[PDB]
């Protein structure tokens, strides 16, 4: 059943990534956000190897662990093997790469140490050939997201001073354990934050669902539904206020990877009619401010950043950190992918007709792969 090491680091990773999400959401009160906690946790994990001094200590203290501590790296490998194994039935793919300047002088034993811990691709690039460089990176991401995220990097995102790009790619294809009958899909009104409404396609089905009620500090009641994928390892949690007028921010402000696990332990299966909007969302988040707010200021500062674990040839700083994410939810299931990059450079009836939260979780490990807020399907 459940294995301690994969679950140990899943828990650390998920808490971190979910705290990042909370920052993104607090910065976009009334817009759709889809986000990948495991995506960002993955890349920042690799970044721990490349950094030193205070830059490194800030990352580590924010993540709650040190990648080079005994067992941590092996646990992360075991985690993604666990996530990808056929026994889940529903399909997860997750891949890590790094693209480094061809003529960059690296610290001795780096690359071998990095390959030993992460087993990822290392590829030599010539960032001076700028357009070819970001074609190389964009094409790798596209491949490892099954065509879903093709153009991760825009123009300018990479230039002559680029020395290293660390990238994760994640792909999820899940089938509901019980699909929503197509004949049950109908137009219905959806109530937005600003009090107005809009008609959107919605899916309905009656089933015995994992469920619990939950209340915020202000007393407000929330419905928490757990929707299973056919493999019985993955689920999507849906959380929405009982009343129409309560802002979703109430939930997101107290949302933790810990509170999600508490929800899971407190669910009971009850017969219910569920009407849930179909939604297809795509987001592109700049991670700079989110990560600074969690205490990683040094790495972005070109006169303060420490990448001495990677190279002493010259001073390096993070020019850009981003995540692209996409998700499609329909009658048959859920398709989701995300790609996160850090660029291092030189110099009863439950009708969900109001904004709601979702979390895609692998339950044996406790890994949050995706989460978002749907403000308008």
UniProtKB/Swiss-Prot annotation:
Tissue-by-tissue expression: Expressed in endothelial cells. Found in plasma, platelets, and hepatoma and fibrosarcoma cells.
Biological processes per GO annotation: angiogenesis; cellular response to lipopolysaccharide; defense response to Gram-negative bacterium; dentinogenesis; fibrinolysis; negative regulation of blood coagulation; negative regulation of cell adhesion mediated by integrin; negative regulation of cell migration
CDD domains recorded: serpinE1_PAI-1 (cd02051)
Family: Belongs to the serpin family.
Protein name: Plasminogen activator inhibitor 1
Claim: Protein biosynthesis is one of the keywords in the record: no
Glycosylation sites: 210, 266, 330
Compartment list: Secreted
PROSITE patterns in UniProt: SERPIN (PS00284)
Origin: domain of life: Eukaryota
Cellular compartments per GO CC: collagen-containing extracellular matrix; extracellular exosome; extracellular region; extracellular space; peptidase inhibitor complex; plasma membrane; platelet alpha granule lumen; serine protease inhibitor complex
Disease implicated: Plasminogen activator inhibitor-1 deficiency: A hematologic disorder characterized by increased bleeding after trauma, injury, or surgery. Affected females have menorrhagia. The bleeding defect is due to increased fibrinolysis of fibrin blood clots due to deficiency of plasminogen activator inhibitor-1, which inhibits tissue and urinary activators of plasminogen.
PTM comment, free text: Inactivated by proteolytic attack of the urokinase-type (u-PA) and the tissue-type (TPA), cleaving the 369-Arg-|-Met-370 bond.
Induction remarks: Up-regulated by coagulation factor Xa (F10) in atrial tissues. Up-regulated in atrial tissues by rapid pacing resembling atrial fibrillation.
UniProt GO MF annotations: protease binding; serine-type endopeptidase inhibitor activity; signaling receptor binding
InterPro entries (alphabetical): Serpin_CS, Serpin_dom, Serpin_fam, Serpin_sf, Serpin_sf_1, Serpin_sf_2
Pfam families in UniProt: Serpin
Keywords: Glycoprotein, Protease inhibitor, Secreted, Serine protease inhibitor, Signal
Organism from which the protein derives: Homo sapiens
